[PDB]
Amino acid sequence: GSSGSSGSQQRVKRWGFGMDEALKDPVGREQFLKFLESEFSSENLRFWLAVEDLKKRPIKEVPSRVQEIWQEFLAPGAPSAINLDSKSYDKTTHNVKEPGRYTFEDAQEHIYKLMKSDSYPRFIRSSAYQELLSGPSSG
Template identity: 35%
Template sequence: MPGLVASQSRELQQLNTNTENKKMSKDRGGNLTSRLQSRSSQSTKTDGLCFEEMSQWSDSLERLLSSKYGMKIFQAFLKTEYSDENIEFWLVCEDYKKIKSSFRMSSKAKKIFKLYIQAEAPKEINIDHKTREVIRNNINAPTTVCFNDAQRIVYELMEKDSYPRFLKSDIYQALMDSTSESVKL
């Protein structure tokens, strides 16, 4: 995973350098202080990702998942732990809740069940037998809430298990270090 962090950091640095060079060429007569301030403000926010946003990821899993970048980085972390089925299931459930057509809902519910819920499913999530059976019965006449219990279980599992490890992970620490260094400039 350090390769992902390094490549993202290099991309951010290259973007900052290109932007800085364009600005410097426009006002070559500017003093050193204004150029450093300009560079610092560019470094703290690049392409929507900034130190402030990343530091808020440690407030809660909800805050992390509400961030486009946080979601992607958390997904990458879960892949390294071979538990990315949890976030995938959670995301699929979020999309499922938005379905309006009963035909589409029925079709999607069966796909979700086969992929994540049924015993020995390719991406089987860790839920209890009772919840699994309730869902099995509910997909015959699915509603927008038929996966809510399983989604809550998976969320709580991520919140109590994966999320604390993510905050201590090399990927998160490296990102925080690289963006906090940019803020210091």
Template identity: 35%
Template sequence: MCKGLATLPATCLKSAKDIKHKISFLLDQKQAKGKIANAAAAKRSEKVEYVDVVVRVPSAAEGEKWKESFSNVMSSELGRSVFTSFLRSEFSQENMDFWVACEDYKNTDPSKFTTRAKQIYQQFVKADAPNEVNLDAATRDLTKQQLENACPCCFDEAQKMIYTLMEKDSYRRFLNAQLMRDLCQTRESCC
């Protein structure tokens, strides 16, 4: 960190980090719109060989299942994808990214545990990490200690905390999101 940034209060650094996430989100949206526009233009000229993104809209039944419990969202690949998009709109996608990284880590070759654990720690857990997740100091310290003997369970407490955060906080807002309301209205109009 440069000397000028080191003298700033933590709240200023947090605000700067939030602005960085918002800008990257807006850039991602602009790039996605550009890809769609380019694909549409190419299609009009009949030069399209493939489309970069295939979007599957969740069915009303899937939406109803997701409303039953957060675990139903997380156990569905499409559910996680839709929920991740929702988290991105709230600038908290790092929570899902961390959860997925922890799941992948559990399936890592044991010879690569130490390296991969350090990467995850540097990316998500360490204070001021690029995609820092919201962990209390005790969990952050416990996770750091467990890195010394990297094993499949060294991120378990941190992962549980982030899962609970998503379930108790973001999931509640997700249920009230426009997509979920639209899925419910589709179901009601069909019956």
């Protein structure tokens, strides 16, 4: 919804519970991400989201993206080039062959199970997250 209501500090806290919540809210998604980019970890998340949306994309932009997403993080010469286990990575590489909607479903799990307690955790440790709670502004 375009419109909202008063009460951001309370909302933020939600994200301090687990990536899950952070994702639900729009601001929490970008906020939590920001910190990632800094630690050059965003790649993990960036890829995740790409998947959730991937399916959303039309059949015309379904396949075209498949390879793309895999060429962004699931690629060797890529910027967000992520890293996955052997058993997992192997399965993915094979799935890629045929572009679909849940082709990268497997990976989504591995990463998700990671970022959840991989990056999210730090977010709480750092202050960037606290900022919102208090109020990131002059005063």
